[PDB]
């Protein structure tokens, strides 16, 4: 490879790939207002990368939004988000919270808060670890999508654990290993974890997208790209 995932065109391409996986649309800027309980046990899932009320990151996002934009319509729901954190309960939230999310998503400031939380927790750590492992943009993207779905952490079902399992099977480029063999190992490790949860059992984001880019040798993740997820085809010129 020759460019990292954080280059401006590659980053935009990354956001469109993840929106195709999360919302079945390459129009990633239409997804800041997404808010749904997809009934997989995480409560509400919201925004560009599926921040959730069950796992702490929706809370972190709304707190940061409230620091940067006092009095916004989500701030009053901070106590409820604190209370349901760690559970999939909607208690204290409901239609008023769903409407306040919709309202906040029309503003620059909420969109900026989502961008910041995405970059601090998920995207910039994927890029930094990819580069430390000697990976191309496509490798960096493999790490980013893993962080989006599985989150950070060293547990076997989080990004750090998936990466540890890959490293046990294949050396990364930074240690002399071949990138293709490393990413095939990484995708194999990730698919094991995906298949352990019924909501993640469909691995097409890997098998008919990421693996395709690797097969094509598209290490810089350059356009034009074509891929499928959930049996639907997508293209980015
Ligand atoms: N065109 C539909 C096709 O969209 C659909 O597939 C479903 O699409 C959903 C939106 O992308 C997707 O939901 C996301 O799932 C991920 C994986 O858990 C979550 O992280 C997101 O929060 C969800 N929004 C479904 O998983 C996916 N099955 C399909 C119906 O099955 O039919 C086509 O006609
Ligand atoms: N958006 C969630 C994401 O939060 C979650 O991953 C967890 O994130 C926690 C806080 O960021 C972290 O402490 C924990 O170790 C992660 N596994 C994943 C997986 O539950 O789901 C995403 O939808």
Q: 176 CB contacts (<8 Å, ≥6 apart)?
A: none
Same domain, 133 and 91: no
Where residue 96 falls (left for φ over 0; alpha for ψ -120 to 50; beta otherwise) is alpha
Distance 163 CA to ligand 2 centre (A): 16
Same domain, 142 and 109: no
How far does the chain reach from its first CA to its final CA, in angstroms?
Answer: 20
Same domain, 148 and 231: yes
Burial class (CB in 10 A: 0-12, 13-18, 19+), 80: buried
Same domain, 110 and 199: no
DSSP-assigned letter for residue 29: G
Task: Give the integer Cα–Cα distance in Å for 203 and 110.
Answer: 31
* Structural method: X-ray
Question: CA of 55: how far to CAs of 11, 44, 58, 72, 203, in Å?
Answer: 25, 10, 8, 22, 22
Contact 130, 219 (CB under 8 A): no
Contact 54, 86 (CB under 8 A): yes
Distance 207 CA to ligand 1 centre (A): 15
Task: Give the integer Cα–Cα distance in Å for 106 and 28.
Answer: 14
Same domain, 109 and 167: no
Domain that holds residue 68: 27-121
Looking at residue 135, which CATH number applies to its domain?
Answer: 1.20.141.10
Distance 180 CA to ligand 1 centre (A): 28
**Cβ < 6 A, ligand 2 pocket:** 42, 50-52, 55-57, 121, 150-153, 158
User: 121, 152, 182 — which closes off a domain?
Assistant: 121
Give the number of the ligand closest to the Cα of residue 86.
2
Task: Give the integer Cα–Cα distance in Å for 136 and 216.
Answer: 14
Task: Give the integer Cα–Cα distance in Å for 71 and 17.
Answer: 34
For residue 230 and ligand 1, the question of a CB distance below 6 A is answered with yes
- Of 88, 230, 232, which is best to mutate to test ligand 1, by the most ligand atoms within 8 angstroms of its C-beta? 230
- Discontinuities in the chain (C→N > 2.5 Å), after residue: none
Same domain, 14 and 36: no
Q: 62 CB contacts (<8 Å, ≥6 apart)?
A: 74, 75, 77, 78, 81
Same domain, 102 and 196: no
Same domain, 20 and 51: no
Which ligand 1 atom is nearest residue 34's CA?
24
Of 176, 177, 203, 186, residue with least CA distance to 142: 186
Give the number of the ligand closest to the Cα of residue 58.
2
- Of 151, 154, 164, which is best to mutate to test ligand 2, by the most ligand atoms within 8 angstroms of its C-beta? 151
Distance 70 CA to ligand 1 centre (A): 34
Q: 76 CB contacts (<8 Å, ≥6 apart)?
A: 100
Element (H, E) at 195: none
Omega before 172 within 30 of 0, i.e. cis: no
Of 105, 107, 108, 86, residue with least CA distance to 97: 105
User: 106, 121, 136 — which closes off a domain?
Assistant: 121
Distance 159 CA to ligand 2 centre (A): 10
């Amino acid at each position: 490879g020759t460019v990292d995932l954080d280059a401006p065109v590659q980053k935009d391409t990354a956001m469109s790939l993840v929106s195709s996986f999360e919302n079945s649309s390459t129009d990633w800027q239409a997804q800041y207002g997404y808010l749904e309980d997809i009934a997989a046990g995480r409560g509400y899932t919201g925004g560009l990368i599926g921040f959730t009320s069950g796992t702490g990151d929706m809370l972190e996002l709304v707190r940061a939004y409230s620091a940067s934009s006092p009095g916004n319509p989500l701030e009053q729901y901070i106590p409820a988000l604190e209370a349901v954190n760690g559970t999939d309960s909607h208690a204290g939230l409901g239609q008023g919270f769903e409407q306040a999310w919709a309202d906040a998503a029309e503003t620059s400031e909420f969109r900026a808060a989502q961008d910041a939380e995405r970059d601090r927790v998920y995207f910039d750590p994927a890029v930094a670890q990819g580069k430390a492992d000697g990976l191309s943009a496509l490798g960096q993207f493999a790490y980013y999508d893993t962080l989006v779905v599985h989150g950070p952490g060293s547990q076997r079902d989080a990004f750090g654990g998936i990466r540890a399992e890959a490293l046990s099977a294949a050396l990364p480029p930074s240690q002399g290993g071949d990138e293709t063999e490393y990413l095939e190992a990484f995708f194999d490790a990730r698919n094991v974890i995906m298949r352990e949860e019924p909501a993640h059992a469909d691995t097409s984001r890997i098998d008919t997208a990421q693996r395709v880019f690797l097969q094509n040798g598209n290490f810089d993740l350059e356009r034009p790209l074509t891929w499928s997820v959930y049996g639907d085809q997508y293209s980015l010129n």
